[PDB]
Amino acid sequence: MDHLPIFCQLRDRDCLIVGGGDVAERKARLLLEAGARLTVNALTFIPQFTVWANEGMLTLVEGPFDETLLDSCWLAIAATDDDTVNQRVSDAAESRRIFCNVVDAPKAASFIMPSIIDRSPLMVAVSAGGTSPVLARLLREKLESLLPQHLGQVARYAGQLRARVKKQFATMGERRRFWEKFFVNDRLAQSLANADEKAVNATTERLFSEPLDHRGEVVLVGAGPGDAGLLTLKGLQQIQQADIVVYDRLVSDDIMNLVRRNADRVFVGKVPQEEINQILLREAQKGKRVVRLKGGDPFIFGRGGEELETLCHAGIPFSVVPGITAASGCSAYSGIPLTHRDYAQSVRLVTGHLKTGGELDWENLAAEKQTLVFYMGLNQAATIQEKLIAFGMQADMPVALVENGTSVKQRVVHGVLTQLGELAQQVESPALIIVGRVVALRDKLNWFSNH
Amino acid sequence: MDHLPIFCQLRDRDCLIVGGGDVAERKARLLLEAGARLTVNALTFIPQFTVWANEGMLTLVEGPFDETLLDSCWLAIAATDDDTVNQRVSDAAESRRIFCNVVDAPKAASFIMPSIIDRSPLMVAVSAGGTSPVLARLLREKLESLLPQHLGQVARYAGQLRARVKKQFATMGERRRFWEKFFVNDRLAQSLANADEKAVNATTERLFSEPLDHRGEVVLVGAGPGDAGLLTLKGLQQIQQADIVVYDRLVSDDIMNLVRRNADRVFVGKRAHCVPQEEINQILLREAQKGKRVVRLKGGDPFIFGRGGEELETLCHAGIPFSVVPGITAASGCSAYSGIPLTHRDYAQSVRLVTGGGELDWENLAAEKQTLVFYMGLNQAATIQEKLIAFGMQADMPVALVENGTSVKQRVVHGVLTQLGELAQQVESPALIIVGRVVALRDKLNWFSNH
Ligand SMILES: Nc1ncnc2c1ncn2[C@@H]1O[C@H](CSCC[C@H](N)C(=O)O)[C@@H](O)[C@H]1O
Ligand SMILES: Nc1ncnc2c1ncn2[C@@H]1O[C@H](CSCC[C@H](N)C(=O)O)[C@@H](O)[C@H]1O
């Protein structure tokens, strides 16, 4: 990330503003509301600074820049229209390791002042680092319309209850469940905004009195096939609140960025199945919220049933959030719809790597008017070609392989069935093989990329 | 104001973390992502730290906290479990005017770490001053769903274009209307993320060529099977940006409640008076030809028995840009929410999604090692049971019917094949017929509750 947002406690800490114009005044007003001990150093001052100075709210130093005024400071702001002066300020701040903002030069000097949405004590800060002030302001207004103006009172009351919550609830999980009920209780928010203290108390005492669940839980969450935008809203909620996230190699890097930063992550990629069940079983017995993040959809060639059998065998509660399976994602993003008019009566999702000497029912798979989608069939692509042809599929049946479907690394190769073996040499796992007349729709429906 | 939010430039600046456990690992990952020149001081380090050190990512100093490690530091984080050590760290940072965070004691320090939504260079930070970390996480979750993953690339590109935008739009009112359709242009964001560097210039040059009023495009969005939580992040983002939403009765009202206020809605579903597909095709064409951002919302997944292919061919001839957001198909939703996985161990080599029109290959559907999922099949249900018994499927094959899958009114009826015709009258559209051995697992994996 380009910047690290922090929320600084400036109360009674010295800060310096150099410059005495309109820009300096708006930054000074901010620092004053944050309680800073403020010095302003400038050749001239607009009248607002004299009004602040006679109220004793800051110190004015009328004159050129004095570097020694930085000696006690925690923050420095260069707010003159003289870039030579602003750079002397920035240089002096740098040598002293004082974070310094140069208002007219965001890319220089060590901090940026963001746009602020204030629901005190709740605060939201927005900045595009100076690369796009219009987007920061567009975003700032949208956030203004979505944050209710009684949220400050809800947050203020939360702060007042924190000691009691810590005293009455022993486990972190029991305290988080209390807070999760607290922050979605609309009647409590309303009673706070109305200063209705009998109602605040009645709801609060009931909240403290509820039996808060003590169980751990396992949620199986389909990550989708790669693109982070293909996570479901419920899936995002689970990994934004998980204690632990058990993920594999087929969950994309972008989806792992949506995981709550405070969550522990355990990789189980290449690990057999007997092991994954074990991690899930024991992390859930610790009373922790566990998410098993699986590529695609958990119940389509994902051994999701096997993970849930063990937890049912152990009395551990669980749920399942379905995901965009690889077939749907690659279909959408390659421009190959899985059904279309009477091209396809049926869609077949097939595994290409099977148990022991188990054989696919090739005469069944070769039937017309269907779309075949082979999962993990890359290394058997030459056998699929041979078998489909031998069991009657026409030689010029279109085929496509979609490698890393829906991601920015997506590659699609396509051809006819007699090419399937050669085409598979040109991609690598993870890839889908799609066989069917719908493949020819690609050059009309492909919106995603030339790769 | 209690805390002043600032966005710090940390690249190549010395920062110090004291502590070497899981808490310090989370803070260190954040400061590494910000490019800090990081030293970590701890009595011991969890292995993730020695990995970072071996990779040259940071510096490890093993031993008790040493004040002089602060001597050139810009930020300090106390991340140990020992209050006495955290206090020594915070006292030593205070006397050096180094902003310091005590992870376990947010008001004992000089800065708070807020929740971060990272779309660099665009950044959003949420904090309530330690009063409400759960509220901050809830807000961060909401914002994470609203802000597209590649927004940052759009932000950076806007910055390169500011020069050109000013000297081509006189009034600042126009310039903003330009930016407003700029930061929502789907193909611009996709073309930036895919490094398709001439599609970027192709859609950049057109953005100035089009009349400022013209935002004409069609997005096919899969609404998923009913539960509003099963919409994708990307689907929600597209719905929030639409001028017009064209939807049908199989789009749940929970999903329609997510489409924002002043968007036009066009209902093309059944009113009794069947609507043929061609008039639907014309409506999208018509609404997109007036320069409006059109979202075609469809139940489930657009490319699985949704005729979505048919709607995009109408647009391809007219030169109307389109894209597709896949959705959770009914088979995936009903499988997760009825505890019937579509695959499991070696119960099924293949999953077949089939419609119930055209003529069914009955010998083919009766073959073993399949999970059969019948879409739109309730009418032919009596025929389906008769034909599958007559073509060799065992009479004791488990069947299930899932009606209104994933909604608060979902009903699931299950028996064996020879009762399939009877069970079908007990449900109504929309319903799935699932035939296969996996159906027996619902007894163990059903976590939703039946209505
Ligand atoms: N992004 C992707 N592009 C192409 N194929 C993918 C893919 N992600 C997963 N797959 C396919 O899925 C196989 C793993 S089997 C697990 C699939 C997952 N449960 C789902 O529903 O999609 C891979 O071998 C590959 O064939
Ligand atoms: N919520 C739901 N529960 C059960 N079946 C559903 C369903 N929603 C859609 N269906 C099935 O889908 C059929 C309409 S065809 C459209 C299906 C959609 N494109 C999808 O991908 O799911 C209905 O006849 C019904 O069989």
Author numbering:
A (entry chain A): 1 to 270, 277 to 457
B (entry chain B): 1 to 272, 275 to 358, 363 to 457
Sentences from the paper on this structure:
Siroheme is the modified isobacteriochlorin tetrapyrrole used by siroheme-dependent sulfite and nitrite reductases (SiR/NiRs) in catalyzing the six-electron reduction of sulfite to sulfide or nitrite to ammonia. CysG is encoded by a gene fusion between a C-terminal SUMT (CysGA) and an N-terminal bifunctional dehydrogenase/ferrochelatase (CysGB). The N-terminal enzyme module, CysGB, is a three-domain bifunctional dehydrogenase/ATP-independent class III ferrochelatase12 that performs the final two steps of siroheme biosynthesis. The C-terminal enzyme module, CysGA, is homologous to a well-studied class of SAM-dependent uro’gen III methyltransferases (SUMTs) that catalyzes the methylations to generate precorrin-210,13.
D262 comes from the CysGA module, opposing D104 but adjacent to R260/R261 and sitting above the tetrapyrrole nitrogens. Therefore, we wanted to know if D262 from CysGA was important for catalysis, so we altered it to an alanine or an asparagine (D262A or D262N). No gross structural defects were apparent. Both complemented cysG deficiency, but the altered enzymes produced the fluorescent intermediate, with defects in the dehydrogenase and chelatase activities. D262N was more affected by increasing Co2+ than CysG. R261A, D262A, and D262N retain some activity for both chemistries. Given that both D262 variants retain activity, however, and its absence from Met8p, we conclude that in CysG, D262 is not strictly required. It does, however, interact with an arginine that directly binds the sirohydrochlorin, so helps form the active site to bind the tetrapyrrole in the correct orientation. P133G behaves similarly to D262N: strongly affected by increasing cobalt concentrations.
